[PDB]
Amino acid sequence: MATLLTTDDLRRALVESAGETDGTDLSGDFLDLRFEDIGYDSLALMETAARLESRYGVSIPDDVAGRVDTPRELLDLINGALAEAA
């Protein structure tokens, strides 16, 4: 911790949204798994993204919000935003 968003950190926020839609490997290793296959609908994705902006004090660019089919892209955005944020 104390530097960027980690696997565990992101996992928490993700599993906070996707609940009652379990059975996937969201709690574990989801980085290269598609939101589609991990039980995420685009609507729930925006919910998560918005909460991320709120909680971590980040700002997700519109172009990035629609390129994140894999949590890897999301992770990258948050890390980029954290590094940018001072």
Side-chain angles (χ1 to χ4, degrees):
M1 63 181 299
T3 179
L4 304 183
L5 192 70
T6 46
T7 310
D8 288 273
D9 197 309
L10 179 59
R11 174 165 58 181
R12 305 176 305 151
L14 294 181
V15 67
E16 289 178 71
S17 312
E20 301 296 88
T21 310
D22 294 89
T24 50
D25 195 74
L26 180 62
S27 303
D29 181 75
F30 49 85
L31 294 180
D32 78 287
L33 301 181
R34 314 300 172 148
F35 286 101
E36 308 180 294
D37 71 86
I38 59 179
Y40 281 73
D41 291 279
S42 51
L43 205 299
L45 182 58
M46 80 175 186
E47 299 192 273
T48 305
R51 183 183 302 128
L52 298 172
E53 300 183 292
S54 305
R55 182 183 296 183
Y56 302 125
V58 301
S59 307
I60 302 179
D62 181 92
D63 291 78
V64 184
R67 67 177 287 136
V68 47
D69 60 287
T70 44
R72 182 184 299 131
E73 298 294 289
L74 198 291
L75 183 64
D76 177 69
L77 188 284
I78 302 301
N79 297 335
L82 296 179
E84 193 58 65

